[PDB]
Amino acid sequence: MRVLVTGGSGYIGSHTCVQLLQNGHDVIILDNLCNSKRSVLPVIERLGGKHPTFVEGDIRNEALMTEILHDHAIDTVIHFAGLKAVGESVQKPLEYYDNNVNGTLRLISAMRAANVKNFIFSSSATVYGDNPKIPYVESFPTGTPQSPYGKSKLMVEQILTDLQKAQPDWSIALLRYFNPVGAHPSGDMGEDPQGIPNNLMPYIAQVAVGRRDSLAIFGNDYPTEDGTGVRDYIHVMDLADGHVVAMEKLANKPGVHIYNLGAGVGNSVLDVVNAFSKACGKPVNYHFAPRREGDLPAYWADASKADRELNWRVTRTLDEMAQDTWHWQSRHPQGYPD
Amino acid sequence: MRVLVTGGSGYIGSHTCVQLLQNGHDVIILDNLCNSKRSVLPVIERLGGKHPTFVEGDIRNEALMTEILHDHAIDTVIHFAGLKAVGESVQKPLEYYDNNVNGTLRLISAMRAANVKNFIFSSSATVYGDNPKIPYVESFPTGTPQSPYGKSKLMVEQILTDLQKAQPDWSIALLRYFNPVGAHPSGDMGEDPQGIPNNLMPYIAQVAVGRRDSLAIFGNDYPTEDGTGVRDYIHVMDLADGHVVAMEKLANKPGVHIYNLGAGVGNSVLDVVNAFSKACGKPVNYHFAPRREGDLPAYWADASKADRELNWRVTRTLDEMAQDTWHWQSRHPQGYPD
Numbered sequence: 001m002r003v004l005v006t007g008g009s010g011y012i013g014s015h016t017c018v019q020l021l022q023n024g025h026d027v028i029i030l031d032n033l034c035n036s037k038r039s040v041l042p043v044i045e046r047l048g049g050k051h052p053t054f055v056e057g058d059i060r061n062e063a064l065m066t067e068i069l070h071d072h073a074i075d076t077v078i079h080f081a082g083l084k085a086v087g088e089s090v091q092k093p094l095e096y097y098d099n100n101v102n103g104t105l106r107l108i109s110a111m112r113a114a115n116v117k118n119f120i121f122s123s124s125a126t127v128y129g130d131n132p133k134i135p136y137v138e139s140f141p142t143g144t145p146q147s148p149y150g151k152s153k154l155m156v157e158q159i160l161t162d163l164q165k166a167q168p169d170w171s172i173a174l175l176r177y178f179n180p181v182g183a184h185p186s187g188d189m190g191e192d193p194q195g196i197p198n199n200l201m202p203y204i205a206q207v208a209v210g211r212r213d214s215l216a217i218f219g220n221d222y223p224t225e226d227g228t229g230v231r232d233y234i235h236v237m238d239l240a241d242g243h244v245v246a247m248e249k250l251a252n253k254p255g256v257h258i259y260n261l262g263a264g265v266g267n268s269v270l271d272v273v274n275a276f277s278k279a280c281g282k283p284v285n286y287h288f289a290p291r292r293e294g295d296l297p298a299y300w301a302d303a304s305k306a307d308r309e310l311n312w313r314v315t316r317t318l319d320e321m322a323q324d325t326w327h328w329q330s331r332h333p334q335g336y337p338d
Numbered sequence: 339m340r341v342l343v344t345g346g347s348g349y350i351g352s353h354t355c356v357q358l359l360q361n362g363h364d365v366i367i368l369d370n371l372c373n374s375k376r377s378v379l380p381v382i383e384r385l386g387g388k389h390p391t392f393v394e395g396d397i398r399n400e401a402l403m404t405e406i407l408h409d410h411a412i413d414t415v416i417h418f419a420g421l422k423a424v425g426e427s428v429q430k431p432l433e434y435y436d437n438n439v440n441g442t443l444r445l446i447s448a449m450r451a452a453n454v455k456n457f458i459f460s461s462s463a464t465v466y467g468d469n470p471k472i473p474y475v476e477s478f479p480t481g482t483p484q485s486p487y488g489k490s491k492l493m494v495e496q497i498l499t500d501l502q503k504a505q506p507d508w509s510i511a512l513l514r515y516f517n518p519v520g521a522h523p524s525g526d527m528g529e530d531p532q533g534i535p536n537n538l539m540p541y542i543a544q545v546a547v548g549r550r551d552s553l554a555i556f557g558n559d560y561p562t563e564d565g566t567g568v569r570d571y572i573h574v575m576d577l578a579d580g581h582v583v584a585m586e587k588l589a590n591k592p593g594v595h596i597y598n599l600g601a602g603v604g605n606s607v608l609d610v611v612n613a614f615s616k617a618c619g620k621p622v623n624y625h626f627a628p629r630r631e632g633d634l635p636a637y638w639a640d641a642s643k644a645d646r647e648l649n650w651r652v653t654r655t656l657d658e659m660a661q662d663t664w665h666w667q668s669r670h671p672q673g674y675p676d
């Protein structure tokens with residue numbers, strides 16, 4: 001199929017593009033480069049074994065989106081583009097609602113214009129809000145996210161749902177991601193955050209590579225087995241694969257197809273640290289700090305639906321997530337070149 | 339004060355502009371004329387007794403908004419502009435989210451740019467969602483509106499709230515309107531819907547003026563005293579006054595000030611019909627029809643907070659709402675001239 005991958009040069013998109021090309025699809029990447037570098041492009045093609053077309057531009061540019069869509073005869077759109085720094089979203093809400101809410105709106109408006117009706121959206125478990133019932137299941141009603149980032153994702157799912165209702169021939173997948181980690185097994189592609197990483201895995205990796213002193217473990221008094229926060233970590237390669245399958249199986253299948261994408265099991269902060277210490281061959285330095293504002297104690301996905309419906313399930317393990325991350329971090333300490 | 343009134347030439351905005359000018363404020367109206375006519379301008383000035391500046395343009399045009407804001411040294415913004423046809427919103431969701439959500443976002447983004455930090459938003463009781471507890475009170479958590487229109491209003495309240503949190507010097511009023519009806523006592527200004535009116539009052543008025551056959555009463559089996567739907571009708575002049583007071587008292591008062599604007603009492607469909615039959619001097623023709631999709635049986639506002647805090651309460655009665663509407667309808671059967 002002909003697919004437009006917005007945010008295609010970012011973390012999850014890059015890996016998804018590789019898997020897409022491996023499957024022989026024709027890939028067009030659209031990215032504004034606010035959080036990625038052109039240097040990843042050659043890696044995508046090399047690892048993907050096929051050339052992906054790249055377009056530098058913004059999802060907020062409806063006219064350009066429409067043109068791309070038509071120019072490349074796109075059949076389906078995978079939308080990863082947007083802003084995702086939780087804390088920053090609290091400090092700069094407008095930028096979040098603009099890039100995520102208006103950004104998606106401009107893109108689907110362009111799709112309508114170009115007669116494109118297959119869409120895949122990067123959603124998040126954050127949409128469940130403060131749900132005491134865990135694991136989270138697609139049948140649960142959504143809750144109220146506590147950050148502008150979380151809210152923006154829920155708002156987009158609602159807009160997409162209403163759109164599908166009004167244009168019933170559309171096929172829209174709402175893919176609720178849990179906690180993406182890991183890197184391509186080659187060690188030549190991975191997450192390349194700029195500045196202080198907000199997520200656990202990259203933070204740990206930077207401590208291990210010798211850039212940072214100690215990992216601050218936010219809270220050790222949660223009601224969990226070890227007192228640290230529990231999450232559902234999912235290898236970016238499994239996530240990528242899920243996207244290819246969802247795209248292939250849902251294209252032209254009318255409806256709003258919601259699926260949680262996670263491993264279906266929880267791991268604590270210590271579990272992650274331990275796996276990384278093991279991967280890197282040295283104990284990762286860490287200390288206990290106060291709870292981070294807005295953090296829930298524990299949650300993970302119920303991924304039965306995706307298994308059942310798409311025959312998709314994770315295959316990489318926690319150790320692999322850690323190992324692949326270290327291999328990338330270690331082979332490319334400065335990330336992608338400028 | 340210097341105030342920009344978006345949607346200023348529409349129903350509620352026109353009446354609010356008249357009251358604002360009467361109070362000696364400097365008014366700049368911004369409207370795209372998608373649902374109003376330039377012909378109202380002269381009426382505003384005449385009844386307001388002062389000239390309001392008019393700018394034809396769209397809230398979605400951030401660059402233009404910023405310019406206006408600066409050019410006119412605006413101190414506060416009253417935002418009435420947007421789309422409000424409930425049923426149409428279901429059929430055309432994107433236009434609703436674009437005009438309302440992105441539309442407001444562009445406007446407050448322009449405000450940030452121009453250093454304007456006092457805002458008044460036209461919200462709605464729809465934000466309470468399906469709340470069994472009536473009357474509705476500002477302290478109730480919001481629910482989930484069932485139309486793209488309702489959702490768009492709730493989304494904007496959330497974006498505004500987050501913005502205020504990030505820029506704490508802002509004063510933002512979330513004015514939750516109930517069911518606006520009535521017309522300026524002069525009979526020379528009022529609601530001028532194009533095509534089939536969606537609301538009860540104008541529909542009744544058109545039946546009475548001889549344009550329509552019979553009023554279809556949507557449902558007669560609700561759990562209400564007479565079986566018909568119950569709402570909180572509020573005279574547009576009282577609404578207008580509430581806006582002037584809110585603007586005057588809340589300007590430069592940091593916070594998100596939420597107030598329900600209603601009469602605090604409920605009236606059934608039959609109650610309204612009866613009042614109009616009385617006003618127009620002939621029995622209004624009507625029949626019973628099935629319930630209209632998405633309609634709640636009964637709700638009204640708890641307006642104690644606005645009374646307490648702003649010393650504001652309604653003063654016009656149901657009969658006046660009916661009479662003023664008939665006077666306008668009757669004096670200007672073709673509405674505002676082309």
Ligand SMILES: NC(=O)c1ccc[n+]([C@@H]2O[C@H](COP(=O)([O-])OP(=O)(O)OC[C@H]3O[C@@H](n4cnc5c(N)ncnc54)[C@H](O)[C@@H]3O)[C@@H](O)[C@H]2O)c1
Nearest residue numbers: 007010011012031032033034035036058059081082084122
């Ligand atoms: N990584 C996670 O932990 C996490 C979990 C839940 C959801 N998500 C979502 O998945 C998507 C991918 O996340 P990621 O980790 O790959 O992040 P990322 O930052 O690596 O990828 C986002 C890409 O979007 C591009 N972009 C941003 N705004 C744009 C705009 N307006 N126009 C065009 N391009 C734009 C960026 O330059 C970047 O390459 C995002 O929507 C994110 O919110 C990720």
Ligand SMILES: NC(=O)c1ccc[n+]([C@@H]2O[C@H](COP(=O)([O-])OP(=O)(O)OC[C@H]3O[C@@H](n4cnc5c(N)ncnc54)[C@H](O)[C@@H]3O)[C@@H](O)[C@H]2O)c1
Nearest residue numbers: 345348349350369370371372373374396397419420422460
């Ligand atoms: N009338 C009601 O029953 C009701 C109840 C709840 C909330 N509201 C809200 O109050 C506000 C005023 O409603 P109203 O009855 O006066 O409606 P209205 O249609 O008479 O007024 C809206 C005005 O906005 C202008 N407009 C629309 N989109 C615009 C855009 N993108 N840029 C610039 N101008 C634009 C229209 O041309 C119109 O003059 C709206 O936000 C509406 O949703 C009204």
Ligand SMILES: O=c1ccn([C@@H]2O[C@H](COP(=O)(O)OP(=O)(O)O[C@H]3O[C@H](CO)[C@@H](O)[C@H](O)[C@H]3O)[C@@H](O)[C@H]2O)c(=O)[nH]1
Nearest residue numbers: 124125126177178179198199200203216217218229230295
């Ligand atoms: O330096 C750090 C970073 C994280 N943590 C803890 O590690 C866990 C994971 O934190 P983090 O990696 O920041 O991810 P989450 O806060 O769970 O959020 C991720 O996963 C969500 C869905 O589960 C998405 O909404 C977000 O976009 C994505 O950042 C939590 O218990 C954190 O308290 C630490 O203790 N120290």
Ligand SMILES: O=c1ccn([C@@H]2O[C@H](COP(=O)(O)OP(=O)(O)O[C@H]3O[C@H](CO)[C@@H](O)[C@H](O)[C@H]3O)[C@@H](O)[C@H]2O)c(=O)[nH]1
Nearest residue numbers: 462463464515516517536537538541554555556567568633
């Ligand atoms: O032809 C008609 C029109 C209305 N009704 C009934 O009259 C009542 C009022 O209906 P309507 O005038 O359409 O207003 P609402 O549906 O209550 O909605 C108005 O008030 C809401 C807040 O209370 C706002 O969200 C909306 O923008 C605004 O249109 C309801 O019981 C309707 O079923 C009829 O029976 N026949």
Ligand code: NA
Nearest residue numbers: 090091503504
């Ligand atoms: Na802040």
Ligand code: NA
Nearest residue numbers: 334335336337
């Ligand atoms: Na670098």
Ligand code: NA
Nearest residue numbers: 165166428429
């Ligand atoms: Na429809």
Ligand code: NA
Nearest residue numbers: 672673674675
């Ligand atoms: Na007319």
